[model samples]
Target: SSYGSRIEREQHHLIESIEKSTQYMAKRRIGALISVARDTGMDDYIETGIPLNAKISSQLLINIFIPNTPLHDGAVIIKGNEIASAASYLPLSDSPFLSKELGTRHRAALGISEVTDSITIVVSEETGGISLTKGGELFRDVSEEELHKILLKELVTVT
Candidate 1:
């Protein structure tokens, strides 16, 4: 169809799958990093990570983040509505102002945001809080509805 419809259709599935994974991780207090690819597309930094380039779905997303799983340690990069890669290592944040309580996952999420325009969703295992990183700022303890709207807005091409 048209441009708007095409993006809308793809965004629908992406959001649904991401939402499901987010809910699962947060409820179980499982830690995970889900970086939504943006205009700058930080693929180079993700080269070391495992590449799947698989279709997006709740099953695929959840499977990778399950505790004690092989690919559960690193971040998941989503590109063009697909699970582009998993187990991708990220740059750790060097900022001293950030709270020491926040762990590597949170700092790594901030680190990626410092270089790229991507949004990183971090589920805290310690507190079971859902956090979003954008432009080096972290939004902690976001509601599911708030996350939904943010993802919807963020995933759209920022041209």
Candidate 2:
């Protein structure tokens, strides 16, 4: 079985927005945490931040994380291809094995993955490296091409 045309289109669109934003941010050393939910019902978690419920776009995403902006403080939560919220907080992963080099962004990214079945994309503030966290694991230094594939793979195949 396949997804309905509208829903599938949205999935790809969201991926494109994220993909483009990551590349742009990485090249310039901007930091961001993009938390993407595959399905609904993370209300308790999602409600912890400010709600935008606006359309998704690469420029919109790029603007939010531009250095000292207020929205850049936390994360951007995506639900059903929409920019659901920003400045959201997530629990920190207290795992001892997490590298000392990793900071709050990576910890928060991995935190949500441990707490919920969501995809968290984190960009390093200093290194500008892009990483993806899901199912309690982190894939570090993911390229734009690989990020696209990684997102599409997790998004499309769900029971």
Every model's TM-score: 0.92, 0.92
Query: On residues 62-151, what C-alpha lDDT tens digit does candidate 1 reach at each position?
Result: 889887777887999988767888999889999897888899999999999988889899999898889999998988889999998898
True-vs-predicted CA distance for residue 98, candidate 1, Å: 1.6
Model 2: per-residue Cα lDDT over 1-159, one tens digit each: 345776777777888889899889999889989999865635665788778898999999998888776788888898876889888887889878788898999999888888788999998988999999997888998888789889889875433
Model 2: weakest 10-residue lDDT segment is 38-47
Alpha carbon RMSD to native, model 1: 1.8
Model 1: CA > 4 A from native: 157-159
Extract clashing residue pairs from model 1: none
CA shift of 69, model 2, Å: 2.6
In model 2, what lDDT does residue 56 have?
97
